[PDB]
Write a protein that binds this ligand. Structure first.
Ligand SMILES: [Cl-]
Ligand SMILES: [Cl-]
Ligand SMILES: [Cl-]
Ligand SMILES: [Cl-]
Ligand SMILES: [Cl-]
Ligand SMILES: [Cl-]
Lengths: 334, 334, 336, 336, 336, 336
């Protein structure tokens, strides 16, 4: 029917450039013969045509069938997708565009001892006649969230930006809007509440189910992208560690390391001998440790007769088969 | 309920900042006690509350009666206002936001020798079964424009941006979108056509009719706002001129320039005499000429014996009663 | 030793560039042959040599006899000058550098029902044993303000910056610092107090008494600078207005505007005839006045009430008065 | 066989952007439908076609006769024009692109007591065999300059950028190049000398002689262009000044002003009466003259000497003379 | 005389900044005590003086013997060098400064059906009476290119900038100039043609033959520069890969890998056992190859075919080969 | 009293941003919930509370016991700490904030043949009557420096900026100030001299002795901080190198490498066989060592003389020694 595999990418903003940067880091650089046209290509994967588009246009064109793949925030996906079974998240966490969609209410007067959705719902002020008015851009997700949390008496007004104005303006009581830093809303005398968070968004690789099950090339490129993306993301959270351990043999050392359950797993330790002039004073284990627990791991393996540790970076980590690929095939099935 | 008169200003972009620049030039500067909020005041006019909003919501809030006045582009006004007669344009030409909503088609294929709206409506390819597809943001105004120029075989897809893409992407045959500088649509191999323009927009002051009639202070402040805005805008296209004519009296000279009908009128000339000694060589006429016709007016005055001319700037020009104020009272039924 | 008149200008910040802007608007532009040296010149005044320094050092050098004139905030002058009689404020208000030195305390703690400086003095917790701890850069001015307000029980810690966080940090109970934008100290949960303002500051022209009497040309150039500065500052608050009025003579019209006391008190109106054309002459009369910017629209409405038609508003660049009070006041401060 | 009138404008740098700002200020705004082409239009003048070019290409294209008019620095005009009689400076002073082409020599070495052209010319070192080596961009003007002053023993290595290096590098003894700020060559241990500057440049309006005589509308638009530029430029050097004079009559006060010769020379003063009220009398009269900006303060002194009270200074956008002296000079250069 | 070894580096623009970044990436960082001067130095190599010059002055000074080494574009080398045998290209591809000198012609005109240089040479419009006019900065290389392709009906004009104008301006038929991104000449209705590329350029390391042969240190420092540069540039195209193979022995694994000819060319694999968690030991074996970045994914797939499992990719900073063929080729050019 | 551990970090300038960069690279990133406060956290360490402060106030609060740890320059530590023995420098060398406090002297006048501190002392001009006047912000250190080097008659004037002016405006004979780039004082015609440097400075980790001994948590987090920081700083001066050697056996090549004393010491080499091809196996062996960056090329020459060929240089992000010399030094400073 159509020859090329079409990837939609954000066109404007920091979301656009962060996406292009992530792609360059995975050897999926975008190239553009005509810089102020909206068509481009990733040469790494021939037959992959990219189309710069606004996040919701990407969701719209995935549904309408004019795109096969896309990168968008989970906010825009769940709002305009509306739970359509054709939209499949391939990677749910590209580690940018971090924000959450949450409820904000005034600190001020009638809301002062209210720090929970339970306690907000508990108030006597709201029956069907005078309901809890709440301004949002998420005209789909707001209703669904309130129904799903058993609150019947709410009325949503829509605004296309600057929602913080609504409570000061008197046009609503609460709001439902994106937050990432938390700056704006204390400065407009608003506050979040426990269980106010509707979802935590970030950039995601998304695909049409019909596109992937339909054409082998679409399934194959999605697989390549997934692997290249997670290989990059995994590596960004890992170091390779080279520690010098005391011991008579290589295999003796290997055990002591392999005994410690806290000590970081990978595929497994390698151990080669560290020479000196007299022969074989230390043994060099080569493991692969998460950045979060680097110092802990250094401390642990000092207790097990370790000495000099050499931390070096990783570019990529390709696991033989990703849990996400399994999960994706499972999401495709029905 | 509400006590205050409310002016909605654009919150974002060049539109926002140009608006604030204009208001400062007319002694209507906005002052913000809390810069991170959306509330503000214009000190010059007491009881006048400024809410920064998106242009779309300025229109909506004017209709929902949550704003009284607003500054907004005619594109956004006619699109989301939908001709609603509660919305009255007080000033239609604040001289920024200059752009036009017009149709653009490709220039390559079947359109190579199609340079008119009727020329493309004439084409056979478009039928009730497979019609002319046009991508637009202006979901309301497009259909309306096609009807009013007799084009029945048309279908409208929506998009949120990057409409230039759609012909190349093959999701549409033409687009209906804003154009100012005009570069963007050569860069995507598109062209405007004869009579393809739907409207020419710029920033405009508008007012709720229900607010003007039934809320105190609204018609008052609208009058002040209108006179101040116009006084500035008028003065921007004028110079005061002081030219030295040759003659034997003030009234002799006065009659010469007053009998030049091409000469630029103000309310009228003013003569004082220019002194010397060998007493009263030239006579100094002071008129007020449009900037557009300066050098012409200087040549004209040289034909009437004029020598030295001094051009100087004007800050404001207040006519006794503006035609725009008259036209408002006329639109109110008066 | 020295043979040139020296003007100290601020070296750093908005304060520096605001100063340089103001001097350019008054035809006193600073030229600089070596953009990152500290010496410079104002050419419009022969033998005037600029030296860029920190505000603090401008006060020091005025006192030390190394500068003759300086532009400096009143906060800095009073703190580092300490009411020294050699330092005279020539112009107390150049309408930039606006801020105030005021006391701030936490909203949260025991200070919820405390919004007056004597309410703060009233509180029982403080005594010579364990006094009111207060952080400030203004280590001279703080003590003086509270001695002068009869508050004996205070201890002054001294910081050089980031004072808004001393209460959070438990190093002091209140602070004494500058406020201008207003935002910073509500964001650190502090508040201002009634009577807690020590002084209003802004950029000011100061001069050395020793210099004015003792160095040739200083007083002459102080005079010129004062006059140009004030003319510009007065001019920035005025428009020239040309209203067209209805009358059968020049003087008839001149009365109706002069018998309106609400109408602006310039030096006085100028009436001249507006000619017009089958063959007629001289309908309106054009009065020219000099109205404050604040009350423009008011004064337009006033003139329309007495038969006014078209108003043309135009800018003023300088307004030189015959003799400013400030010049007389300076000579009186000098005993001249 | 070209049919439009063609103005060459600098395509690059601050030269380019100052040129466009000047033409905007004179209602000769440049409009460009395709910003990434080099062709453009000035709408105010019908038939006028701008071409953005590098200054030396502007000169080369005026000579080859692909342009009619151009704006370039007198530096590049003189270098590449070479005294060609087809080029005529219509305006030699647009008040931007200010720089001088001059000789710079080392401070440090055998030059410490050499502060003059003749002083360095007289020195015994330089001879037919080993000459005075001079690094320069200006390959035409260097030889011409030093022949015209009489320095036989000189050799001209050419370089096209970064000339201050040449002395320090050893490739030459002196440079000939552009200076403005005077900063750069203190930092490379060099100095200018007396009688060492070849030329003082700024932006200039230049016209082809063949174009003015030969092509329809060139001489006509050169006139318009000159008169609008000159009007703007004159107005930037002037103010209008209105002063209040105590007097009996308006001819009496005029006599007092006109017989002060050092006071400014606008075509002439205007006196109108100032009405005041007592009773509606008309005590003083309002003189309005137009005064050079540099001379504003003296002119106010000079007016207060003649019982002048309060002065209002205000700006001028343009001043058109009846016939600008430059137009008389241009016609003179054309053999009229 | 002169003691020091001199490297010319571009002074201006992006060429300058990219050259300085590359040298920093090779531990050949330039240090500059006086940023306003043109002299500087690289510490890592002793007695090496850096001089910032415009790229054509670099080529000019290499010829005159005032520089020993230089980094410039092959365009400016060939245009100003003119095949001079004193100039030798040591490294012809530093992977920045990429552009191509090519002929461009109109799209519209009569030129729509010519997309080849011989197809425009086939056009019979051009004779000795009225030849093919072509404007260019490259006055030496233009004729020499046209001569060598057999087109004697051409006359060259010279412009120094804004050459895309010359067709629309009417002053020439085609142009010869630099292209990289490709956008600028679409915007002026021009197109390239097949075979019309005169030269593909990039930044190159160049040396004077007289300097290498007859100056102490040059050949030595050239050797070091060449190797440090090429080591960095090679490592930018490579990764190191640590893949886990299923095997019964280390040498069994090594065989399976080396039996793949399509698999990467490291000097060889380094296999080591990977230990496993009751008392189990040593199931996987870890090879380390060194694959090009181009072929990474392919090579992972190739490895997974041979029972490869987890792969770890990590960066290289430098790859020093034993002998660089570029170094051997240099010595060859010195008759050595 | 107070429950958190408190680290002072610079609040303004490059000093502040370079500090936060270093802390980011050592997994000690600062997280600020409220950017417009001066309080912050490092999440990596439990109960650690960052306070942004001016460097002077970090020293002042370390003495007053309101902070436990700080990062400041050694310039600020010795001026404001004044050898106080509660203040202990934990790491003296964070490789940013590089400058030196040193005397500068005019080059022009009586000081032309004065390039030494003793030559300056020796000068007859200075006496108890009229001393050597020297301008400085370092009110404590200047006098102490002069008394330590027996300069008998010296008056010290204070300034808080723009000291380079002080000679030019005749208020001082010399200055004592920070110098980093060294450019600022050629511009203002000053020079440093032999023995001018009072101290060389850079950013340093500093701890309160009472806080280490008395407040538990501190010593533990100091250990952690020191180890992470030095681990980073050491890794910035190393590469890992993987040369491969021709050899018959594995400890044969280990020998030849360990016999070279000039070759890179780490803890020692590792070596594994490199396999390569009817059927051939195990030609050369891959040595892996850890060379300092400054000595990289030297080490590669060295390894080639031992029959080495290919070298693969790669980056290290941290090097953790088992126990650091600076930690031992810290303990011994706690009488331990
Ligand atoms: Cl936020
Ligand atoms: Cl557009
Ligand atoms: Cl503040
Ligand atoms: Cl210069
Ligand atoms: Cl290009
Ligand atoms: Cl410095």
């Amino acid at each position: 029917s159509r020859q090329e595999i079409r990837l939609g990418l954000p066109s404007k903003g920091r979301m656009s450039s962060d996406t292009l940067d992530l792609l360059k880091d995975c050897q999926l650089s975008v190239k553009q013969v005509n810089p102020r046209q909206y068509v481009a290509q990733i040469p790494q994967i021939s037959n992959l045509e990219v189309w710069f588009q606004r996040p919701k246009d990407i969701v719209r064109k995935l549904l309408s069938g004019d795109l096969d793949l896309g990168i968008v925030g989970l906010d825009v996906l769940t709002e305009f997708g509306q739970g359509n079974e054709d939209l499949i998240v391939v990677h749910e966490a590209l580690e940018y565009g971090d924000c959450r969609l949450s409820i904000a209410i005034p600190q001020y007067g009638i809301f002062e001892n209210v720090n929970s959705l339970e306690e907000l719902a508990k108030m006597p002020q709201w029956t069907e006649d005078k309901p809890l008015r709440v301004a949002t851009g998420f005209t789909y997700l707001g209703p669904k969230f309130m129904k799903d949390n058993g609150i019947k008496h709410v009325a949503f007004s829509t605004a296309d930006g600057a929602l913080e104005a609504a409570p000061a303006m008197g046009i609503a009581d609460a709001i439902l809007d994106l937050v990432s830093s938390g700056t704006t809303l204390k400065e407009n005398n608003l506050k979040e509440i426990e269980g106010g968070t509707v979802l935590e968004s970030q950039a995601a690789l998304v695909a049409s189910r019909r596109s992937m099950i339909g054409r082998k090339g679409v399934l194959e490129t999605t697989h390549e992208m997934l692997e290249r993306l997670e290989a990059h993301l995994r590596a960004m959270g890992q170091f390779t560690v080279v520690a010098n351990m005391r011991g008579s043999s290589a295999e003796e050392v290997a055990e002591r390391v392999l005994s410690q359950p806290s000590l970081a797993g990978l595929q497994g330790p390698t151990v080669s001998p560290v020479f000196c002039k007299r022969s074989a004073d230390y043994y060099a284990i080569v493991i692969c440790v998460p950045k979060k627990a680097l110092y802990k791991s250094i401390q642990q393996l000092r207790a097990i007769g370790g000495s000099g540790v050499l931390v070096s970076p990783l570019t990529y980590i390709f696991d033989e088969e990703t849990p996400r690929w399994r999960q994706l095939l499972s999401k495709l099935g029905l």
